[PDB]
Design goal:
It is built from 4 helices and 11 strands; from the N terminus they run H-E-H-E-E-H-E-E-E-E-H-E-E-E-E. It is an alpha+beta fold. Strands 1-9-6-11-4-3-2 form a 7-stranded antiparallel sheet. The longest helix has 19 residues. The structure holds nickel (II) ion (NI).
Length: about 220
């Protein structure tokens, strides 16, 4: 029953604030991104690198800390795979969804370690811009679903006023997960109320999040 429907996906972005747009880059490109990502991750996990851009929380006792983000991803040492961040299809996808020219404003690798991943608390990425003005492209380097720690969102919430309290919005709902296959690109409005659950299961969830913005938009506060 599956389909590929870019126009409907843009419509769902406009209406619900998020959409899975399916594959954007050739599978081989996704594969290299994944490899680059893992090389970034193993430095933390296996070789013991600790830096400001490697966001982690500590666990009680024996455990090594849990890595959940690599910040400033475009600055990190992982050329030549890093160059793939700047494939033209990505910004063109974002420009289409948001219906105007865009410039990337932030690059991150977000991560669910196997077994130990925490949730990401509900939030809105930005509210100092109008709806359909700044979006995040989530390039999924893994299969992700509900009990894996995939993205969850409240449909329509990107349209709520700036002063909307995220907790009343989450408690209201509805809350809908966003299942993805490796290669999928999810695009969501920065105003969207969204989070992700914990990863208690044994798989990674690795995602490259790039923020694209109307160049006339004020910067992140
Ligand atoms: Ni977010």
């Amino acid at each position: 029953t599956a389909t590929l429907d870019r126009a409907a996906a843009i419509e769902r972005f406009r209406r619900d604030g998020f959409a899975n747009a399916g594959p954007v880059l050739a599978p081989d490109a996704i594969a290299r991104l994944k490899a680059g990502a893992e090389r970034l991750i193993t430095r933390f996990t296996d070789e013991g690198l600790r830096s400001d851009d490697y966001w982690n929380f500590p666990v009680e006792g024996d455990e090594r800390p849990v890595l959940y983000r690599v910040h400033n991803l475009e600055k990190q040492d992982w050329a030549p795979e890093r160059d793939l961040l700047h494939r033209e299809e990505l910004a063109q996808l974002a420009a289409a969804f948001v219906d105007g020219p865009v410039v990337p404003t932030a690059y991150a690798l977000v991560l669910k370690e196997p077994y130990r991943a925490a949730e990401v608390p509900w939030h809105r990425d930005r509210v100092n811009v109008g709806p359909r003005t700044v979006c995040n492209l989530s390039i999924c380097l893994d299969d992700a679903g509900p009990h894996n720690g995939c993205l969850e969102a409240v449909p329509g919430s990107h349209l709520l006023p700036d002063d909307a309290e995220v907790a009343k919005v989450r408690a209201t709902g509805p809350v809908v997960p966003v299942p993805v296959s490796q290669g999928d690109v999810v695009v969501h409005d920065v105003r969207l109320v969204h989070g992700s659950g914990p990863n208690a299961n044994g798989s990674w969830r690795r995602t490259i999040v790039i923020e694209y913005a109307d160049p006339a938009a004020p910067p992140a506060p």
